[PDB]
Write an enzyme that holds these catalytic residues in place. Structure first.
Site, PDB file in Angstrom:
ATOM      1  N   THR A 183       0.793  -1.231   0.000  1.00 18.32           N
ATOM      2  CA  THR A 183       0.000   0.000   0.000  1.00 18.32           C
ATOM      3  C   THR A 183       0.830   1.287   0.000  1.00 18.32           C
ATOM      4  OG1 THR A 183      -2.256   0.272   0.758  1.00 18.32           O
ATOM      5  CG2 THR A 183      -0.471   0.842   2.329  1.00 18.32           C
TER       6      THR A 183
ATOM      7  N   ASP B  84      -1.183  -4.172   4.100  1.00 16.11           N
ATOM      8  CA  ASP B  84       0.077  -3.750   4.729  1.00 16.11           C
ATOM      9  C   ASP B  84       0.289  -2.272   4.527  1.00 16.11           C
ATOM     10  OD1 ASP B  84       3.003  -4.187   5.619  1.00 16.11           O
ATOM     11  OD2 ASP B  84       3.291  -3.268   3.637  1.00 16.11           O
TER      12      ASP B  84
ATOM     13  N   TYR C  77       4.753   5.508   4.702  1.00 12.55           N
ATOM     14  CA  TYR C  77       4.234   5.443   3.330  1.00 12.55           C
ATOM     15  C   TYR C  77       3.344   6.660   3.014  1.00 12.55           C
ATOM     16  CZ  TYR C  77       5.543   0.474   3.841  1.00 12.55           C
ATOM     17  OH  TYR C  77       6.211  -0.704   4.081  1.00 12.55           O
TER      18      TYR C  77
END
Ligand SMILES: NC(=O)c1ccc[n+]([C@@H]2O[C@H](COP(=O)([O-])OP(=O)(O)OC[C@H]3O[C@@H](n4cnc5c(N)ncnc54)[C@H](OP(=O)(O)O)[C@@H]3O)[C@@H](O)[C@H]2O)c1
Ligand SMILES: NC(=O)c1ccc[n+]([C@@H]2O[C@H](COP(=O)([O-])OP(=O)(O)OC[C@H]3O[C@@H](n4cnc5c(N)ncnc54)[C@H](OP(=O)(O)O)[C@@H]3O)[C@@H](O)[C@H]2O)c1
Lengths: 252, 253
Positions: free
Chosen positions: A28, A57, A62
């Site tokens: 992700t 995940d 991120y």
């Protein structure tokens, strides 16, 4: 329905956590840092689900992945085994690391909030490479243990880079996320150890640089009985469907 | 979510030499509709439908491919006009094995039977189905002048050779319209035929193109040759079809 092969009947336990996961998990990174449209993202989750995936995940590092996922998972949160991380932060150009108890606690609370939930199934230490030092000499791992006791997380572990670190993460923790692909096999001992002691293994970067190539990768990865799932990032629904097909076949 | 079919061939159509026909750079091979796990009328219809939506308008068949021709007539009812059909003459498969007949009588008989099976008044391209002895068949049998006649009569739109030899591919192009040739990562011997065609505005179709994605590597080889109009790929796997289309599109940037 150019999608006959699914993973519905191939779910597997993630060590002794009591969690049951599809052998592929949706990475992700690309949801937060060509980014999918809310629409494109919702369709990808919808498709993953219909392909029998229930593992997702993410990580604070991120970009906005966590932030976006909360809303996107509204109404279906229960279906998903969520994996997130603590310790890597990404401020300005670059990665910042903080493995203090204060920050661990702050990050997991923020992650619960961003994901609009009361608990995350698994939270992994986001290592900078110095796995063993972080595990022995920082506060992060006992803090995760506490958060597990308090019910804020279901299980904990390490997203490591070293074999020495993966082994130690498994002495008291629940799961080690490791790199394993056609070009990198150094972390294999961590997998073999986990298999001997009913412990969780997730493989990251299963597909890499250099007779379908994805199948060759998955045939390598799932030849190791220790592996519960491989996390593959993709925003290309055709690639997702293909990856699912190849996983199903590799597991005959 | 089923717009997982982003890359298509709609804007990549190309002329097949000087025939006036315009073809997608991939064609749907059709052996598996007629020989041996064979697709269910349903599965076959969905594969054609999918091909069409992926921008394919080229379809390849042959009397030798078991019941391919016979099945395609009904399957193409209501959409025949979309398709550039390629079929063949000369190879017949009567029992365990191939039987070859390149006589004028049989050529004529086969093409009429093909029109009938396909429920149509003509076929866009008909290729000689060689046994390997290309040059001998072209020089010393009746098939090629018969095909020329059938072209004059309007029963076929163009003619050519599905050959195996370079000498045969070159000769097929002296008076015929198109040569179907083997060209893939492992077999490059027929490259002169392609290069010659490119020099003279003549049709080339590549068969057995497949034999760091492997399909992309194959298509990057094939379409690196400017002579090639299309590659014929056989597949009954809709996911493979979609992937193949994607790779073709990318290889042609
Ligand atoms: O992050 P990370 O690199 O550590 O994650 P990763 O698991 O190593 O995934 C990295 C890349 O694999 C690509 N990929 C996934 N499935 C594919 C497929 N079926 N065919 C071609 N490429 C594929 C994804 O790009 P795509 O979005 O191009 O699939 C993604 O960018
Ligand atoms: O005529 P012909 O049958 O001789 O054609 P060909 O070019 O010689 O190859 C035919 C074979 O290619 C396979 N194929 C096509 N696309 C593929 C893909 N994307 N991935 C894996 N296999 C693929 C088909 O298998 P499938 O029918 O299983 O797709 C078919 O059996």
């Amino acid at each position: 329905s150019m999608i006959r092969d699914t993973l519905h009947d191939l779910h597997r336990p993630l060590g002794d956590t009591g969690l049951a996961v599809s052998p592929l998990g949706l990475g992700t990174v690309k949801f937060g840092r060509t980014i999918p449209d809310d629409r494109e993202a919702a369709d990808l989750l919808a498709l993953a689900r219909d392909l029998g995936i229930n593992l997702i995940d993410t990580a604070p590092a991120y970009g906005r992945s966590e932030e976006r996922l909360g809303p996107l998972l509204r109404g279906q949160r229960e279906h998903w085994v969520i994996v997130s991380k603590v310790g890597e932060e990404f401020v300005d150009g670059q990665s910042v690391f903080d493995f203090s108890a204060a920050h661990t606690r702050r990050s997991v609370e923020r992650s619960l909030k961003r994901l609009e939930t009361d608990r995350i199934e698994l939270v992994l230490v986001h290592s900078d490479g110095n796995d063993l030092d972080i595990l022995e000499n920082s506060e992060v791992y006992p803090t995760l243990a506490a958060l597990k006791r308090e019910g804020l997380i279901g299980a904990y572990g390490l997203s490591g880079k070293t074999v020495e670190g993966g082994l130690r993460a498994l002495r008291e923790g629940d799961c080690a996320m490791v790199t394993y692909n056609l070009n990198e096999r150094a972390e294999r001992p961590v997998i073999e150890y986990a298999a001997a002691h009913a412990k969780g293994i997730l493989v990251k970067k299963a597909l890499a640089s250099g007779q379908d190539p994805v199948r060759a990768s998955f045939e390598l990865v799932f030849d190791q009985p220790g592996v519960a799932a491989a996390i593959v990032g993709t925003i290309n629904p055709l690639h997702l469907a293909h990856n699912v097909a190849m996983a199903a076949q590799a597991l005959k």
